[PDB]
Design a protein around this ligand. Sequence first.
Ligand SMILES: N[C@@H](Cc1c[nH]c2ccccc12)C(=O)O
Ligand SMILES: N[C@@H](Cc1c[nH]c2ccccc12)C(=O)O
Lengths: 102, 102
Amino acid sequence: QSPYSAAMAEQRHQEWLRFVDLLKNAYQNDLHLPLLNLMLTPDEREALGTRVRIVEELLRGEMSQRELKNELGAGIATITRGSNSLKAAPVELRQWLEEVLL
Amino acid sequence: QSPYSAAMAEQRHQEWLRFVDLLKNAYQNDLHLPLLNLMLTPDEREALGTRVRIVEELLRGEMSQRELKNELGAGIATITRGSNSLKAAPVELRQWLEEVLL
Ligand SMILES: N[C@@H](Cc1c[nH]c2ccccc12)C(=O)O
Ligand SMILES: N[C@@H](Cc1c[nH]c2ccccc12)C(=O)O
């Protein structure tokens, strides 16, 4: 699975997959909310909420550098993270976000 | 929604819900993996993977304090976080995890 199959890496990788599957199930059972609440800190949840917006406004292409930073709290670093992260996503996600966010 | 409806709080709260819904959709479209990859840092993913284990072993009731800390990296604080977090979950999640993790 992992781009570097060792045993430790692979393990960490599988544990992540185990989380994904857990969640998938949670959704199927309408237990997603409470699960995510359990698994994440308040601050992490808040951060996820914000990243959606950052992702949102990056796709939109209206908000400027100073705008992102001052209104959403995104400076060169964060906007760098968000950006390359967007470039790294397979095109299908990028297409989907367009339809869905926008 | 929020246990303290203001405007700022509620807003933050809704943004989180917007994330939940996004993800729900992603799952429905088989775009969950790439989405989560986009939305989370490597370290956050790793942490999620570990929390599953911590949650796992807390439910199981075999692993001791020293064991959790030394094997899973969980000291009094983390095990405190994990614990009260478990107590805070509605009983339906607690029941479900039993069936599913165990
Ligand atoms: N996948 C991103 C996670 C993240 C951090 N900050 C963000 C801002 C916007 C979107 C995603 C992000 C990265 O690993 O760095
Ligand atoms: N909901 C937990 C998130 C968390 C932190 N560390 C954990 C360890 C195990 C399970 C959950 C957690 C809390 O807010 O603190």
